[PDB]
Amino acid sequence: SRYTTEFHELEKIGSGEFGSVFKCVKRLDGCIYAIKRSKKPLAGSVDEQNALREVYAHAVLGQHSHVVRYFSAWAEDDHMLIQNEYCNGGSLADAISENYRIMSYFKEAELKDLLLQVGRGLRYIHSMSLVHMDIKPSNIFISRVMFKIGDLGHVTRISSPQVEEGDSRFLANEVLQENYTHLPKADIFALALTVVCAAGAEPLPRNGDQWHEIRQGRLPRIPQVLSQEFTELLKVMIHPDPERRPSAMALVKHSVLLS
Ligand SMILES: C=CCn1c(=O)c2cnc(Nc3ccc(N4CCN(C)CC4)cc3)nc2n1-c1cccc([C@H](C)O)n1
Ligand SMILES: [Cl-]
Numbered sequence: 001s002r003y004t005t006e007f008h009e010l011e012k013i014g015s016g017e018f019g020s021v022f023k024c025v026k027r028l029d030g031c032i033y034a035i036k037r038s039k040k041p042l043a044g045s046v047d048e049q050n051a052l053r054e055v056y057a058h059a060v061l062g063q064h065s066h067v068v069r070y071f072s073a074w075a076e077d078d079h080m081l082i083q084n085e086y087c088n089g090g091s092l093a094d095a096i097s098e099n100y101r102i103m104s105y106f107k108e109a110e111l112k113d114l115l116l117q118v119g120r121g122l123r124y125i126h127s128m129s130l131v132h133m134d135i136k137p138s139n140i141f142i143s144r145v146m147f148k149i150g151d152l153g154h155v156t157r158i159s160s161p162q163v164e165e166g167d168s169r170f171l172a173n174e175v176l177q178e179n180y181t182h183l184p185k186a187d188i189f190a191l192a193l194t195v196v197c198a199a200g201a202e203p204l205p206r207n208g209d210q211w212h213e214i215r216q217g218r219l220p221r222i223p224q225v226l227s228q229e230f231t232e233l234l235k236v237m238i239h240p241d242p243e244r245r246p247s248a249m250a251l252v253k254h255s256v257l258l259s
Contacts, residue, residue, distance in 0.1 A: 068148045091138050
């Protein structure tokens with residue numbers, strides 16, 4: 001087995017319908033990697049589509065400091081294995097949970113740094129004519145601080161996109177409406193709600209009234225003291241008109257975030 005041969009398994013760091021992820025050290029180089037191991041999807045299935053979106057995302061993107069680096073992918077014993085960068089900080093989602101417990105927080109300065117850094121990653125993805133389509137805390141990973149976009153299984157072309165809808169909680173209305181003429185702006189919407197989660201918002205709605213209230217352009221209630229100017233920024237990032245939301249490039253060059 002290549003997996004056993006090339007790597008020694010240290011720790012299971014994730015599990016779910018995606019299978020399992022393991023912290024592994026690669027024998028040859030002594031470095032740490034996160035390796036996803038899953039059953040090879042049934043041919044013709046959503047799972048196979050998602051897996052192909054991921055393979056061909058790596059084929060296009062190469063390497064960037066706000067994107068989780070992809071190293072290799074193979075199949076064996078009817079399983080597939082994906083070897084990625086190990087981000088020693090876990091996901092933003094884990095860090096938010098930890099904050100909700102110890103009890104610490106992301107204040108304004110930290111939130112702005114998160115917006116900029118993930119924004120840089122988006123900027124790069126979009127310039128390669130791709131969109132991520134599943135931005136959320138559990139898909140943002142931390143190295144220690146560097147924030148990096150991972151989990152590329154929903155990535156698709158700005159056109160023609162094969163749209164597998166992301167998490168309903170972070171999903172823009174126009175995507176739900178089968179309008180895919182400005183998909184980059186859906187990544188922007190999701191990022192803003194991602195930053196709102198980091199700022200300590202209650203769990204985001206999956207549907208019903210408050211869900212629609214957000215797509216009407218209204219920020220979920222936050223628990224802390226944010227500037228009117230940072231607020232306005234997040235507000236326009238979920239503007240019902242995706243053309244009014246800033247592009248990634250407009251985002252990374254904004255006075256509020258700069259530095
Ligand atoms: C390879 C697949 C995707 N993936 C990365 O690319 C990737 C990069 N870095 C890391 N670092 C990392 C993550 C979690 C932890 N924990 C340590 C303590 N635990 C009890 C809690 C968690 C420590 C370090 N994890 C990553 N991936 C990963 C890990 C888990 C679950 C999922 C799902 C698919 O979203 N993905
Ligand atoms: Cl666009």
